[PDB]
Structures are given as structure tokens and as C-alpha cells.
């Protein structure tokens, strides 16, 4: 019960560091923050939805 919210406050913090840190592209060309940019560009348009991809989530934190 008391460990429930204490786990959650540690998952809701590792799901947040995924959106905030996941990048694409290599080092030769240049990078791109994939989900911050889509969050911003979908919020400013007034859409309020991102499309997370499960392969990315897997490759960041298994």
C-alpha cells in the first residue's frame, strides 16, 4: 500500500526521463530530440497527443 505510491513515484520518474532524453540520428550527421519536439509542435497546434513507439521505449529502458 505504502510501497505502491513509492514505486509509482519512481516509475512516473523513469517514464519522464524517457520522453525528455530519447534522441535519434547518428553523430556524423546530427541528432534530434524525438518526443520533446513532437510534444511542443502538437501542443502549440492544439492537438494534445503524441505517438510513442514501443521499440524506442524498449531500447531506452528494457
Amino acid at each position: 500500500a505504502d510501497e505502491g505510491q513509492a514505486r509509482k513515484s519512481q516509475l512516473q520518474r523513469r517514464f519522464k526521463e524517457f520522453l525528455r532524453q530519447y534522441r535519434v540520428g547518428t553523430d556524423r550527421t546530427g541528432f534530434t530530440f524525438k518526443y520533446r519536439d513532437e510534444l511542443k509542435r502538437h501542443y502549440n497546434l492544439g492537438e494534445y497527443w503524441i505517438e510513442v513507439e514501443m521499440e524506442d521505449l524498449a531500447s531506452f529502458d528494457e
Binding site: 534522441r23 547518428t26 553523430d27 541528432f31
Partner: protein
């Protein structure tokens, strides 16, 4: 001839010139080029890359460029046949050969002016000695002995040119060169590893030789990637890492 050292005999001659690179079509030769490229774009050496596919196209390519340039480099082509005749070049043109095919043709070995070989001689080579294959009654009495010599030659040829095989990959000779100059990187190490793995994939070398070469390359891999001993937590995740694996023989099972 045989190039004794690659620094002061192959590189520092073409360092100030305009070379022309002929390239065969196999993963070994691609990975043997992509290192020489990166070794030329680092010292501002004007080259030119001609992709050939046979002997007819190599001859056609040599037809057109044979007056502008007078340096050449052949990569995985033209070490098992004779060169000074199929191309019929001039005298002041130089050829470098960095091929894997075996055995090296005879005349290409006793021609120390125009066809230099970047082939490390500590491979499985047993080239016959020089005069064994190259040049009144007493006249006939001795020309019969020369006829005996020719008869021995007709046999020792058949002894030497009867089996074809492959030596150390090109992309490992080039990497030895690129390490001598102290200008090696990971990107030039991955191409070495790929140019070696390809021979074993296409089954052109023996398992003994493959494991020997892997044993060689692992020292380099550990020299580069071990320098990150405990700082692997403060190294950029977006920076290539090569690692030694003892892994399955299934093909493409990770995709």
C-alpha cells in the same frame, strides 16, 4: 617486388601525387577501399575511384586514364595473372597490388621496377627460386642440358600454379598501415573486422587462420575500447563501441 615497409615505400611516395584506385566488387575490397579513402582525405591526396568488375572493364578503364596519371593502385585484382602484358603499360608507370588471390604470378615477383606488392611475405608463400623458372658439338651437348632445364620448368610450374586460395584480407594490411602512421580510429577498425569476417563468411579461409586473425584483432579492440575502464558511465552513449562476443552461428537472428 615485395614492399618491406609500407610507410616509406608505398605511402610516402603517393603522398604527393594524383593516384588512381581500381576497385574490384566484393565486401573485402569495399572495406579495403574505405580505409584507404579515409587515409587520403586526411592528408589531402587527390585520388580517383574507378569501380571495375572484370578483366574487360579493367582494360577499358586503363585505356582512357593511362596518360594523365602515372601512379596506380589495384585492390583485390591482378595478382594471380601477369600484369605487364594485359595492360601493356609504359615504363614510367608504377603499379601497386594489394590483392589476396594466390599464388602470386611469377614474373610479378621478379619485376622490381613497375609492379610493387603490398603483400606481407609471411603468408603461406613458397615462390620458386629465381633461375629455376627464368633464364661444334659442345653447343648441342649443353643445349640438351638447357632443354632439361626447360623440362624441369614445365613441371615446377605445374607444381606451383595448381591450387588457388586466399591470404590475409586486404582490409587488414591497410589497417596495419593506418596504425603505423598513428592515424587509426574505431571507424577504421570496424572496417577491418568486417573485411576479415567476410572471407570466413564466404568460406575462403580455414578456421585456423580465421581464429588466428581474430586473436590478432582482439588486442586492437581491447586497446581502443578498454581505455574506457570505469568511465563507461560518463562516456557519450552516441559514440561507437566495439566488443568481443562469443555468439551464435545463426544468421541474422537479431532482426
Amino acid at each position: 617486388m615485395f614492399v618491406s615497409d609500407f610507410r616509406k615505400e608505398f605511402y610516402e611516395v603517393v603522398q604527393s601525387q594524383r593516384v588512381l584506385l581500381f576497385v574490384a566488387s566484393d565486401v573485402d575490397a569495399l572495406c579495403a577501399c574505405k580505409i584507404l579513402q579515409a587515409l587520403f582525405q586526411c592528408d589531402h591526396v587527390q585520388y580517383t575511384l574507378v569501380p571495375v568488375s572484370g578483366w574487360q572493364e579493367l582494360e577499358t578503364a586503363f585505356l582512357e586514364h593511362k596518360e594523365q596519371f602515372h601512379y596506380f593502385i589495384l585492390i583485390n585484382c591482378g595478382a594471380n595473372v601477369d600484369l605487364l602484358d594485359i595492360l601493356q603499360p609504359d615504363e614510367d608507370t608504377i603499379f601497386f597490388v594489394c590483392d589476396t588471390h594466390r599464388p602470386v604470378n611469377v614474373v610479378n615477383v621478379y619485376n622490381d621496377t613497375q609492379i610493387k606488392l603490398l603483400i606481407k611475405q609471411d603468408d603461406d608463400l613458397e615462390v620458386p627460386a629465381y633461375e629455376d623458372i627464368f633464364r661444334i658439338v659442345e653447343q648441342t651437348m649443353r643445349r640438351r642440358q638447357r632443354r632439361e632445364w626447360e623440362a624441369r620448368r614445365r613441371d615446377i610450374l605445374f607444381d606451383y600454379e595448381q591450387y588457388e586460395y586466399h591470404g590475409t584480407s586486404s582490409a587488414m594490411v591497410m589497417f596495419e598501415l593506418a596504425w603505423m602512421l598513428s592515424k587509426d580510429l574505431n571507424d577504421m577498425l570496424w572496417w577491418a573486422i568486417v573485411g576479415l569476417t567476410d572471407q570466413w563468411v564466404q568460406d575462403k579461409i580455414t578456421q585456423m587462420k580465421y581464429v588466428t586473425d581474430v586473436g590478432v584483432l582482439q588486442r586492437h579492440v581491447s586497446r581502443h575500447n578498454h581505455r574506457n575502464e570505469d568511465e563507461e558511465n560518463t562516456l557519450s552513449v552516441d559514440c561507437t563501441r566495439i566488443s568481443f562476443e562469443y555468439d551464435l552461428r545463426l544468421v541474422l537472428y537479431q532482426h
